[PDB]
Design a protein around this ligand. Sequence first.
Ligand code: HG
Length: 208
Amino acid sequence: MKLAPYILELLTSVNRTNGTADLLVPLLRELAKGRPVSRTTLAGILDWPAERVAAVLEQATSTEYDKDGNIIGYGLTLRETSYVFEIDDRRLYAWCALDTLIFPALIGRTARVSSHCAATGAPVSLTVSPSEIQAVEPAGMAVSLVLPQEAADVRQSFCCHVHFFASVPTAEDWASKHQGLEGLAIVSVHEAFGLGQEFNRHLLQTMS
Ligand SMILES: [Hg+2]
């Protein structure tokens, strides 16, 4: 219920240098176009030397690149995951369930999100807009949260534990067999979306 520790630690894990948020939003908007993103493209959008783009990305250890050295994944990714994230006619993916709830507001576009329950395999889907969620299927969908670690790779420490589930009772049953994960908690997808909204508010307030 109390979500401050999650917001605080995720902000710390995500915002590791000056300009991270400045870079992250344009990057997500470019990735949402469905093609690899070159550093020079970001440099142009930001009015930064490409050097600076590189230094910000270097601190982002989980960043995925393709065989050309272009960016293909940073929260939103072109590389298949369990979380499908579609913007119009482009199929993208996300690193975790919470990412799917956060990115639409940051990109300014509505996403069709689909996945499978981590406990039962049942398909789950919803439509996520910058301001609300809709067509939640099934209606009682839930999300797992853990406390992000500050100095760890965000995918290894946070993303891999943050799933969708068919329902709260199903997720709580799953959670009962998952001890030793700091801050493990089950919330409804609505509660998770509200967490995402608070995270975004704090993130955006740190932009130039
Ligand atoms: Hg994530």
